[PDB]
Homo-oligomer: A and B are copies of this chain.
Amino acid sequence: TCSQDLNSRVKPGFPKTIKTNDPGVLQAARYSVEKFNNCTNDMFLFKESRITRALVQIVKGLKYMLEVEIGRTTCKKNQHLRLDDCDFQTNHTLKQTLSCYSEVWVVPWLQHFEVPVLRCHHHHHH
């Protein structure tokens, strides 16, 4: 499986630290939680709640490597609700947070984004 770029015209980028409030980082964390909502069957939408760590790598575009917390909101899935206007669950029985790692590839000049990696963990209540 030699599907590699082994004679690249550009020197490949290495991941570098980036501020966790960088507008690009913030948008990448939104993509991540949207990938999560798309890929699960909760009755509520989740929303990014905290970005603890972030790296960005140049690869024909921007690849974000993110450590992001996501939380259940009070907005139901499948009602065409926008996450910017969703607040987190207050009800303790409905409060749920996950710790995720994601990689998000964004090519703004081609209007393209992808979330090729998303790993999430809900910690046991014991």
Contacts and interface: CB of A to CB of B under 8 A. Distances in A.
A61 interface: no
B8 A120 contact: yes
Interface string A81-99: 0000000000000000001
A27 interface: no
Interface residues of A, number: 33
Contacts of A120: 4-8, 12
Nearest to A100: B12
A104 interface: no
A53 B36 CA distance: 31
A112 interface: no
B6 A40 contact: yes
